[PDB]
Amino acid sequence: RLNVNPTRMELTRLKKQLTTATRGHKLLKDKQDELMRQFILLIRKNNELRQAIEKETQTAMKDFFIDELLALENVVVEKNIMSVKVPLDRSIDGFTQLLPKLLKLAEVEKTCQLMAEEIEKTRRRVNALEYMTIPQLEETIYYIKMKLEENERAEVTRLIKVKNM
């Protein structure tokens, strides 16, 4: 439990912090359940994309004086989805086709990684509240209320003894 001095004023303050903590734990897991929904549709799409482009890019690589000809044509936007920012000669012909195909593969695979990173930040946010913050308070409140009662219980006890004097 977090170190604290037992007082009636501290009891009510820790009582209000736990109620806000319990609701905040509810909301961050809702964000955890939500992220799991938009990640899952995007991830399955990426998995199918990645598999298709992978094999297709290799077969392009598979089909691929040659040094002198390659000597001498030189040719990401920030979008916020939810709480996460998201970025936006036959073998030669296959290369140019794949080059657009790889840019969309880059601005999609990197998007899923940013979803997984924010998923992990929220996940550990949620986990700490359930395993540390809220339990530390729950045990703290127990000790606080314990002390106050026996203290007033032992305080009125001596007052009965002083009354006999």
Partner: protein, 186 residues
Amino acid sequence: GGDISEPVTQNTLRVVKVFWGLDSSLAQKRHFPSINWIQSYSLYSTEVGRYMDQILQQDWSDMVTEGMRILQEEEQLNEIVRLVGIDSLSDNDRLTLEVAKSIREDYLQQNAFDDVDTFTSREKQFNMLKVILTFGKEARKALSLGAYFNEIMEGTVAVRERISRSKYIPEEELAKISSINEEIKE
């Protein structure tokens, strides 16, 4: 044990009008004078605001209310943000955090031993407040110009330091403090 629920303090606060509650958590952090702003109060804060509004002919009672509101808003944020964390803090809310930090370390934090911080005159207490308050008010207009949070700070570290040593300005050199209002706008 810092327990103000004892009868001595409780009976005292039923007859006094001003309460300067000292906090241990701020004293250990070398914050001085370690007066708990949320916890402390003053029944004279209303009438002194009316007098101070007249002497310097400035709306002092409501710019003091704005400073107390900022410190009150931080305590609301800090308590909802201790456990949740500030990573999802909105850009607008983050400014208030940097406004409250400036109010706490620049104005409230003062050391008696240094000859300068020991005394603040009525003209100095206004100029420093005028810098920090107009900052949070005009930098609000900066963040409402489609600006990200990270930016306006990074480009104002030079102004934000002159704000730190605003207590240090001698009484004669007060123009130094009042000149921070135009550079923060620019």
